[PDB]
Structure formats: structure tokens, C-alpha cells
């Protein structure tokens, strides 16, 4: 057969290509086998990073994984939390689900301020009354919000 022609009657044509339309090499049989990182019948479809999200990841060039907006990571499977979420995580993009004991919007206000700071002086007992809020119970002879006379 002449160059690039294959088969018994030299009818099957195959010539290696490396452009936008296809990325392939030719077999002993003149079959269209794709180059490394490319797939599909025309070899113009890029193979993504193995494990790239089928829901939030994409391809233009192998072996990349470009993220859908709101998603991050190597596989684009991790959500981007609402900036700036402090003591919290996300399940969906732009979420800020708080931890214990934390609140509320950005998960930065302490729900256990008494256990973290202990602001009541002179033998005062305190209880948590909300995010970044506390209440001191003062003994006899001591006044003020923190029992500081």
C-alpha cells in the first residue's frame, strides 16, 4: 500500500493528527487510536483528572479539572464556604454550617463564653445567655456586670 493507506485493497485511510479536531495516531491496521489524555471516536475529547466531579468539573485540556462556580479542590467536589466562615463548614456552595458551640452567620460568636473567658470575678457564677453573651451571678458585697464592685 501507499503511505497512510491500509487494508487488502488499500482503501482505508489513516494519517496521524494533532490539532483541535483530533489527537490520534494510526495502528498497524490503520485504526484511529487516540494520543495520551484524549478519548472519543474523533479523539477531540480531553480526559479529565481521574476522579474529577462529573457534576462540578470539566475539561478543555488533559488532564485538568476546572471547577463550577461555588466549588473547589483537586476534583472540584468541595464547596466554597461563605466568606468568611470561621468555625463552620459547608455541604452546598456559600453555606456556613456552625460547629458546637459556635454561632451564627459566620460562626464566629462564642456560645460558651463563660467556659472560654470566665469573666465573673470574686466568686461569681455565670451562665451562657446566647452568642457572645453571658450573665454573672454575684455574691454578697459585690456589684457590677462582672462582680468587680
Curated annotation (Swiss-Prot):
Annotated spans, Important for interaction with NOTCH1: 13-21
Tissues and organs where the protein is expressed, per its UniProt entry: Widely expressed in adult and fetal tissues. In cervix epithelium expressed in undifferentiated subcolumnar reserve cells and squamous metaplasia. Expression is up-regulated in cervical squamous cell carcinoma. Expressed in bone marrow cell line HS-27a which supports the long-term maintenance of immature progenitor cells.
Glycosylation sites: 31
Disulfide linkage: 1-10, 14-26, 34-43, 48-59, 52-65, 67-76, 79-90, 85-96, 98-107, 114-126, 120-136, 138-147
Localization, UniProt: Membrane; Cell membrane
Segments forming domain EGF-like: 44-77, 78-108, 110-148
Domain DSL: 1-43
Stated role: Ligand for multiple Notch receptors and involved in the mediation of Notch signaling. May be involved in cell-fate decisions during hematopoiesis. Seems to be involved in early and late stages of mammalian cardiovascular development. Inhibits myoblast differentiation. Enhances fibroblast growth factor-induced angiogenesis (in vitro).
Entry's disease: Alagille syndrome 1: A form of Alagille syndrome, an autosomal dominant multisystem disorder. It is clinically defined by hepatic bile duct paucity and cholestasis in association with cardiac, skeletal, and ophthalmologic manifestations. There are characteristic facial features and less frequent clinical involvement of the renal and vascular systems.
Subunit structure: Interacts with NOTCH2 and NOTCH3. Interacts with NOTCH1 (in the presence of calcium ions).
Domain observations: The second EGF-like domain is atypical.
Protein name: Protein jagged-1
Gene that this polypeptide is encoded by: JAG1
Amino acid at each position: 500500500c501507499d503511505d497512510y493507506y491500509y487494508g487488502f485493497g488499500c482503501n482505508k485511510f489513516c494519517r496521524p493528527r494533532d490539532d483541535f479536531f483530533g489527537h490520534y495516531a494510526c495502528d498497524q491496521n490503520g485504526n484511529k487510536t487516540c494520543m495520551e489524555g484524549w478519548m472519543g471516536p474523533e479523539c477531540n475529547r480531553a480526559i479529565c483528572r481521574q476522579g474529577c466531579s462529573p457534576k462540578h468539573g470539566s475539561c478543555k485540556l488533559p488532564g485538568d479539572c476546572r471547577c463550577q462556580y461555588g466549588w473547589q479542590g483537586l476534583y472540584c467536589d468541595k464547596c466554597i464556604p461563605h466568606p468568611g466562615c470561621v468555625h463552620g463548614i459547608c455541604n452546598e456552595p456559600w453555606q456556613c454550617l456552625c460547629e458546637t458551640n459556635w454561632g451564627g452567620q459566620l460562626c464566629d460568636k462564642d456560645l460558651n463564653y463563660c467556659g472560654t473567658h470566665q469573666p465573673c470575678l470574686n466568686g461569681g457564677t455565670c451562665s451562657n445567655t446566647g452568642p457572645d453573651k453571658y450573665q454573672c451571678s454575684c455574691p454578697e458585697g459585690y456589684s457590677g456586670p462582672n462582680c468587680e464592685i
